[PDB]
């Protein structure tokens, strides 16, 4: 079984190794630290036997909505990064990480929408997001360094 709690500074090293094992977008140590410092309340880790086995890293923004059609300014939650170690997948961890972060984005940061980018090839991630009622808003052509497209996926809070 797993539990969830807010990320702390001491977790960063484990988070980074998870990032590097599971994702190609490998952010530097200081990048993790700044997100923890500025958006900590919405930054969670999943824990098994006092080891970190997954995390979600958020960013809180203010700007044009990508749900509304003509220009409207809103507070937005952005999922910068989420990952769960291979051995611990299909247990609801990502789902609960997203729920916790969304609730914080709404209650702590007054966000009224959450969005993210996902590789169009990333079948498991897209499945998860759609189950949580994210909608594909647009395709960000060539969004990744290799040229791969991303879906921008979003939902209101
Ligand atoms: C995507 C990822 C975070 C999901 O983690 P997870 O803890 O296994 O997700 P959950 O257990 O909460 O699954 C939630 C639901 O999403 C869907 N889903 C998750 N993984 C799936 C997969 N491998 N194939 C099909 N559907 C999947 C399922 O509907 C699942 O519900 P179910 O188990 O009852 O069928 C995980 O696979 C991962 O760390 N991938 C690599 C990193 C990554 O791609 N991050 C996302 C970049 S935007
Ligand atoms: Ca992806």
Numbering used by the authors: 11 to 167
What does the paper behind this entry write?
A BLAST search identified Ard1 from Crenarchaeal Sulfolobus solfataricus (SsArd1) as a homolog of the Ard1 subunit of yeast NatA and Naa10p subunit of human NatA. However, no Sulfolobus homolog of the auxiliary subunit of NatA was found, so SsArd1 alone may be responsible for the protein acetylation. SsArd1 has a mixed α/β-fold with 7 β-sheet surrounded by 4 α-helices and contains 4 conserved motifs, a feature unique to the GCN5-related N-acetyltransferase (GNAT) family.
CoA-bound and CoA/peptide-bound SsArd1 structures were almost identical and could be superimposed, with root mean square deviation (RMSD) 0.12 Å for all Cα atoms. The CoA is bound to SsArd1 in a bent conformation in the pyrophosphate region, for pantetheine fitting to the narrow central cleft and the acetyl group reaching the midpoint of the tunnel. In the complex structure, the adenosine 3′-phosphate group of CoA is placed on the outside of the tunnel entrance and exposed to the protein surface. The side-chains of Arg100, Thr105 and Asn132 contact with the 3′-phosphate of adenosyl moiety, pyrophosphate and pantothenic acid, respectively, by hydrogen bonds. The crystal structure of SsArd1 in complex with CoA revealed that Arg100 was the only residue contributing two hydrogen bonds to the 3′-phosphate of adenosyl moiety. In contrast, the positive-charged guanidino group of the Arg100 residue of SsArd1 occupied the space and formed a cation-pi interaction with the adenosine group of CoA, which may force the acetyl group less deep into the catalytic pocket for larger protein N-terminal residues.
